[PDB]
A paper describes a structure:
We have solved the 1.9 Å crystal structure of the Fab fragment of RAC18, a therapeutically important Ab with protective efficacy against the plant toxin ricin, an agent of bioterrorism concern. Ricin toxin, derived from the castor bean Ricinus communis, is a prototypic A-B toxin. RAC18, directed against the A chain, has the greatest neutralization activity, in vivo protection, and highest binding avidity. In this manuscript we compare results obtained using different Ab modeling tools with the actual X-ray crystallographic structure (1.9 Å) of the neutralizing anti-ricin mAb RAC18.
Residue numbers in the entry:
A (entry chain H): 1 to 220
B (entry chain L): 1 to 214
Write the structure that this text describes.
């Protein structure tokens, strides 16, 4: 069947360039045009342009003229897209697509290639355990927190008790501030089982080869 | 550039219900409109093309119509797997463009948020920072207002909010609000408050603490 396989994620600094691929299979490459689409964080979709495999002819969205360059290698049934003079505004997921039936545009999509542009330096997160207010809390259930601040790049893997607690967990999307990410996670436990039955926040950040544990302890 | 505007950013429905999403083109685009469905972590998927034709394999519950500037996308009977983001697109003009999307969500009984406030961790203060965190969890609907109050005065500067998508299990929403100040400034105020305003109550849910008071 028709398949479009895109290359892996890339992380570069402002001013750099990147070249990604889109390998077609399951059909005769030169039989259809290859379109490219950009989707930025908030899920905003924008058309970048298209290339005609047989001739290499290209059509671009005026907005991306000079920023993106489309090319093809008929030999390997692969389409490429190169971005230059990158800026944080170029960070997004880029898709390649092909039409179907007759006139059914964007019927087939690649899985997308994530591009992240930032001047930030790899920074391991500061992990802070958040115990309840010193005063007291009500009820038999209690919520605890974990603040993961000042890291780069994404992602981090946060777990509670090494993953043993998941049901009452809420891990929020990270927020970018001054080139660094921050996220928080809360866990709610029942039956007055804290602090009697220990709870620890674990955070792994592969980019910095770090893994830290922070036990939640009553404030004293 | 032709702008495609969708009827809503979010829509709530129930399994078995009939739902319709509309899109308006800023200019006549004849019937060169398509509708896509997208799930988290996945690529968009073509459902309707040329305004009214179902793409190969698309279930009969999906239909669309329109020509000119006003288009409709309809799900005759919503199924659980249909909760996702839907986008319209026009390809009559250049460049072709997409609407901003409409997220179809599941309706459930209203639920007040569970609010918890957290003073800065001792470890963070040693670095000169002071983040006060407030979690507002498992509420419905998504509409909510959080405001911070320091010694009775409302504070907006230094506050960052983060939201989770509707939970797949209990259909509720959760939010985290963080007020970040320096240790220097944090140590010059006594009472810290995070109050949440939600339709489930005319009165705000207030969580507070006084610095250094144990």
């Amino acid at each position: 069947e028709v398949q479009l396989q895109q290359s892996g994620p890339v992380l570069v600094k402002p001013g750099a360039s990147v070249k990604m691929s889109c390998k077609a299979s399951g059909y005769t490459f030169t039989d259809y045009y290859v379109n490219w689409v950009k989707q930025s964080r908030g899920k905003s979709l924008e058309w970048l342009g298209l290339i005609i495999p047989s001739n290499g002819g290209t059509t671009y969205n005026q907005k991306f003229r000079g920023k993106a360059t489309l090319t093809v290698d008929k030999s390997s049934s692969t389409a490429y897209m190169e971005l230059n003079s990158l800026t944080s505004e170029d960070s997004a997921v880029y898709y390649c697509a092909r039409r179907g039936l007759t006139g059914a545009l964007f019927a087939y999509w690649g899985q997308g290639t994530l591009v992240t542009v930032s001047a930030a330096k790899t920074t391991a997160p500061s992990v802070y355990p958040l115990a309840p207010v010193c005063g007291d809390t009500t009820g038999s259930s209690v919520t605890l927190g974990c603040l993961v601040k000042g890291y780069f790049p994404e992602p981090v893997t946060l777990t509670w008790n090494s993953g043993s607690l998941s049901s009452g967990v809420h891990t929020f999307p990270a927020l970018l501030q001054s080139d660094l990410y921050t996220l928080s996670s809360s866990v709610t436990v029942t039956s007055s089982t804290w602090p009697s039955q220990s709870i620890t926040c674990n955070v792994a950040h592969p980019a910095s080869s770090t893994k830290v544990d922070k036990k939640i302890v009553p404030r004293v | 550039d032709i702008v495609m505007t969708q009827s809503h950013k979010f829509m709530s429905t129930s399994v078995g219900d009939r739902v319709s999403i509309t899109c308006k083109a800023s200019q006549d685009v004849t019937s060169a409109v398509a509708w896509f469905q997208q799930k988290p972590g996945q690529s968009p998927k073509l459902l309707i093309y040329s305004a009214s034709y179902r793409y190969t394999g698309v279930p009969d519950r999906f239909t669309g119509s329109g020509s000119g500037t006003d288009f409709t996308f309809t799900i005759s009977s919503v199924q659980a797997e249909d909760l996702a983001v839907y986008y319209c697109q026009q390809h009559y003009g250049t460049p072709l463009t997409f609407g901003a999307g409409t997220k179809l969500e599941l309706k459930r009984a209203d639920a007040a948020p569970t609010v918890s406030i957290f003073p800065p961790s001792s470890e963070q203060l040693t670095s000169g920072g002071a983040s006060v965190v407030c979690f507002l969890n498992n509420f419905y609907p998504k509409d909510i207002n959080v405001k911070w109050k320091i010694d009775g005065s409302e504070r907006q500067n230094g506050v960052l909010n983060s939201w989770t998508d509707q939970d797949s299990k209990d259909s509720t929403y959760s939010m985290s609000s963080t007020l970040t100040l320096t240790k220097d400034e944090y140590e010059r105020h006594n009472s810290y408050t995070c109050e949440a305003t939600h339709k489930t109550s005319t009165s705000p849910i207030v969580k507070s603490f006084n610095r250094n008071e144990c």
